[PDB]
Motif scaffolding. Sequence first.
Motif, PDB file in Angstrom:
ATOM      1  N   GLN A 255     -19.035  24.837   0.182  1.00 22.86           N
ATOM      2  CA  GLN A 255     -18.724  24.846   1.623  1.00 22.86           C
ATOM      3  C   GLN A 255     -17.699  25.733   1.910  1.00 22.86           C
ATOM      4  OE1 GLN A 255     -20.301  25.328   4.342  1.00 22.86           O
ATOM      5  NE2 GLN A 255     -21.276  23.334   4.956  1.00 22.86           N
TER       6      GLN A 255
ATOM      7  N   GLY B 181     -26.177  33.779   0.442  1.00 23.99           N
ATOM      8  CA  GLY B 181     -26.574  34.271   1.625  1.00 23.99           C
ATOM      9  C   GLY B 181     -25.613  34.895   2.631  1.00 23.99           C
ATOM     10  N   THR B 182     -24.662  34.098   2.667  1.00 23.27           N
ATOM     11  CA  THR B 182     -23.323  34.837   3.132  1.00 23.27           C
ATOM     12  C   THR B 182     -22.586  35.927   2.459  1.00 23.27           C
ATOM     13  OG1 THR B 182     -21.702  32.943   2.590  1.00 23.27           O
ATOM     14  CG2 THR B 182     -22.874  32.658   4.624  1.00 23.27           C
TER      15      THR B 182
ATOM     16  N   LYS C 214     -26.615  28.922  -2.491  1.00 21.97           N
ATOM     17  CA  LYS C 214     -27.516  29.862  -2.049  1.00 21.97           C
ATOM     18  C   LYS C 214     -27.292  30.223  -0.565  1.00 21.97           C
ATOM     19  CE  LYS C 214     -31.567  28.345  -0.523  1.00 21.97           C
ATOM     20  NZ  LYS C 214     -33.044  27.657  -0.682  1.00 21.97           N
ATOM     21  N   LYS C 215     -26.780  29.443   0.258  1.00 19.59           N
ATOM     22  CA  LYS C 215     -26.144  30.153   1.472  1.00 19.59           C
ATOM     23  C   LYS C 215     -24.966  30.678   1.357  1.00 19.59           C
ATOM     24  CE  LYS C 215     -28.503  26.230   4.343  1.00 19.59           C
ATOM     25  NZ  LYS C 215     -28.286  25.028   4.755  1.00 19.59           N
TER      26      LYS C 215
ATOM     27  N   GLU D 256     -18.562  32.993   5.042  1.00 18.02           N
ATOM     28  CA  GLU D 256     -19.038  32.984   6.667  1.00 18.02           C
ATOM     29  C   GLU D 256     -18.076  33.504   7.574  1.00 18.02           C
ATOM     30  OE1 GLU D 256     -20.689  29.227   7.943  1.00 18.02           O
ATOM     31  OE2 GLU D 256     -22.173  30.296   9.237  1.00 18.02           O
TER      32      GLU D 256
ATOM     33  N   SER E 192     -28.236  24.653  -2.240  1.00 27.49           N
ATOM     34  CA  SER E 192     -28.380  25.081  -0.718  1.00 27.49           C
ATOM     35  C   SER E 192     -26.845  25.982  -0.508  1.00 27.49           C
ATOM     36  CB  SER E 192     -28.775  24.092   0.337  1.00 27.49           C
ATOM     37  OG  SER E 192     -27.644  23.229   0.924  1.00 27.49           O
TER      38      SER E 192
ATOM     39  N   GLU F 186     -28.536  20.591  -2.447  1.00 21.57           N
ATOM     40  CA  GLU F 186     -27.278  21.139  -1.670  1.00 21.57           C
ATOM     41  C   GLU F 186     -26.294  21.820  -2.433  1.00 21.57           C
ATOM     42  OE1 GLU F 186     -27.757  21.025   1.968  1.00 21.57           O
ATOM     43  OE2 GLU F 186     -29.773  20.711   1.054  1.00 21.57           O
TER      44      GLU F 186
ATOM     45  N   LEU G  33     -18.426  29.157   1.070  1.00 23.08           N
ATOM     46  CA  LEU G  33     -19.414  29.620   1.858  1.00 23.08           C
ATOM     47  C   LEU G  33     -18.768  29.894   3.206  1.00 23.08           C
ATOM     48  CD1 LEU G  33     -22.877  27.748   2.730  1.00 23.08           C
ATOM     49  CD2 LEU G  33     -21.554  28.653   4.843  1.00 23.08           C
TER      50      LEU G  33
END
Lengths: 51, 51
Positions: free
Chosen positions: B37, A42-43, A38-39, B44, A35, A32, B40
Amino acid sequence: LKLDKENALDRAEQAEADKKAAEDRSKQLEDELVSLQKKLKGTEDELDKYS
Amino acid sequence: LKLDKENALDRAEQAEADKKAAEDRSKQLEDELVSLQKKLKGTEDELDKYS
């Protein structure tokens, strides 16, 4: 006794089980981090696409 | 049995050291996952700012 070894072993065996659980948490958290990174990327790749 | 309280206590100290190294990793990876996060969500929410 067998109870001293069993209690010390319950601590060691549970600590090995907790090592499995702690490793399950740390490896899943590393998976994660991948994850999330990568996200995050991704963002970030999407930031560039939107930007 | 007799010394297996000691062998399993030292095994518990090692297994606890390794569950702790995995758990210390789980905490560090948790701090990183949360940092990723927040980054992210940085990206995001910024994906939305651009979108």
